Point group: D2
Chain length 222, copies 4
């Protein structure tokens, strides 16, 4: 049936125990938040930012979507981004992908004629896919999957650094770091894919694509 009681009971029991252990647990954040992190990751049920990073409420503001995609043209994601950088002044942006990611697999195998919105949505994976024909072809179904997940992370990290929000934030001395990481559903573990990026100079050193040229294109002409 559709009854919520065992869900709510489970909630109750959880909140009961947290306040028991630390009394200000909830009350400190009853009227405000001051998270340090923004996390962008996949909507996937195996990937709970707070749980995997063992965080308590108030620590990590979270955008989650299918494929952990970041696009200037997505107001959903860009809103979580604007708000946390400009208003909450967070310090760290975690861009998190995960092995076994359906959106990455779908991005690899589907035929664009596939119907529905998920397929509209994952067009960004296809774009990353297309730029890396060389890292992907003649790899096993499984290695391709893993590679695709990582390339996506790296592409999304780029997108975050190139976002007008992060770029305006850098232009005004606000400390903002951006981090490419990956999670393994089968192990609970997080490895760092790209070392911390804290401004242009870092991105120049750490990102395959050229952010400087992206930012200053006309400097590349006559």
């Amino acid at each position: 049936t559709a009854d919520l009681s065992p869900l709510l009971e489970a909630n109750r029991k959880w909140a009961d125990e947290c306040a028991a252990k630390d009394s200000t647990y909830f009350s400190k954040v009853a009227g405000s938040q001051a998270p340090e992190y923004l996390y962008i990751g996949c909507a996937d049920s195996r990937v709970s930012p707070a749980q995997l990073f063992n965080m308590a409420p108030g620590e990590v503001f979270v955008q989650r979507n299918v494929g952990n995609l970041v696009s200037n043209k997505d107001l959903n994601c860009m809103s979580c981004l604007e708000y946390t950088v400009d208003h909450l002044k967070i310090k760290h942006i975690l861009v998190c992908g995960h092995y076994n990611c359906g959106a990455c697999k779908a991005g690899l195998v589907w035929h664009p004629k596939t119907a529905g919105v998920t397929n509209l949505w994952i067009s960004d994976v296809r774009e990353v896919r297309d730029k890396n024909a060389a890292k992907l072809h003649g790899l096993s179904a499984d290695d391709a999957w893993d590679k695709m997940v990582e390339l996506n992370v790296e592409a999304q990290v780029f997108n975050v650094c190139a976002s007008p929000i992060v770029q305006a934030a850098w232009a005004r001395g606000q400390p903002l770091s951006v981090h490419g990481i990956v999670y393994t559903p089968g192990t609970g573990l997080v490895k760092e894919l790209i070392k911390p990026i804290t401004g242009m100079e870092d991105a120049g050193a750490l990102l395959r694509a050229d952010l400087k040229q992206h930012c200053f294109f006309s400097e590349s002409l006559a």
Copy 2:
């Protein structure tokens, strides 16, 4: 400072501890997921569904965005909805507001001219607000804010119920329930705000706006 091992270490501990409490915790999801719930909640750092419902991985699919908004025209949220209803066949949609929600307050206070993407993104909140002008007219700041949060949850439940994905699932005799819940950051407590909605009938009984009339409007033309 932006190092990340601290965190990375906290992840390790967590994953070992869980692997200690249970040997097949992570391993049983290495290569699939069968969650029963899709959750749509605020990206607010205080409100981590898997945590607050004491769920383990593989249990809840999560869309999180600024103001827990659901729109047919937002491909971000729509693809979480399609992929869970259609590929994953989840049984329960949780639509969760939370008190002290900045998006809800911003929808009461900002002038539409404010700049930025957040302001654009929370246009839906203003629309819920304009539609309920009278319920809100008169109340104190604090009261209005709380009322907005609640009207918003109800409006977002309605929008999930009215979405193409859900109507199509209902017309296909898919078992699928939709829940209006709110959460009190200052307490860790979730309260059911709207009883379970499992189809048109439930919704005709339970919602302040007319789903039937939304779904069959032309039947009432001459």
Copy 3:
């Protein structure tokens, strides 16, 4: 066949004759534009702004979409809007709907379970539809159609006036007028539906919905 030659020939013959009649016809706008109008109307093949208003190149900048819809959350439309108000400094915004509009009919009759993107897209028509149960019910299929087209015009005019672009433009003394009009495919004719709106005071007088309250909501509380 797919050959363009009769299309290009037709173009050629057209450009030939225009330059023949007036030599600066094209050349004056070869390197720039200074249009006075922005037109927002339907993608419908019977509704060619320049032709119906007998305009020459450089006069009217044009957004056209299915249903002539205006939404803060649509970057396509909002871009045409931002650009012409902020950069080109246009004076007049024409919001134009048209009888026999499919998007309006579809908005009336379809069941939201309908598949595809057009149905996602016209959700705004349904929203206007829902607010006007009273002006529409027990009207003939045809009168309902016509009414729905007009209500949409009026709703879109509101949306344009409430847009952050138009609102910021008003706040800085920039003269900007907004106009609700309608076109008849079967007659070539344009009637004015709403008299010119040139700022708040006008909208207050000319729009059914309350723009002032929309702009200053908190002034409606305690």
Copy 4:
């Protein structure tokens, strides 16, 4: 001054004159349309397709936006595409750039941090640009600009060809052609920039990016 009769009068004259040249000009479309073309062009005031192609009403369905961009994820343009391909069964998609396009220049010159929605919207242009960095590296301002316009038209042709709506039409043996055209505001002249594309074959022959590989990428995995 914002009166509107002037215009309204020009509309009258036009409509009488056309009704003079032909008695059933408007009347034959009063209650239907069967255009053969969908046109996707810049919202630029200088570029009115029905006018420049000397088409009468009922002949061209029109999407117009800032930079003639086509994205699977833009429901605005996508619904023009779906409704024309699927309901109307048009035969020819015209994808039209134009020289002296501000969006194309903005995609060369702006810094991603610029503010506003336009800048967000033209992210696609920057992506076409980054992908062709080398073709553009070195050229004069004037030359680059022209080159951007042309790379953009080709990229947008590719995106129409790769869209779900078109691939699905092609796989259904629908006759459907896609054309890359550019237009010179200073002359009234359209030039064919890419020969007609009527299916995969055409596109494999005619496009600089690999449609086949985009459509069947996984076939090249081990």
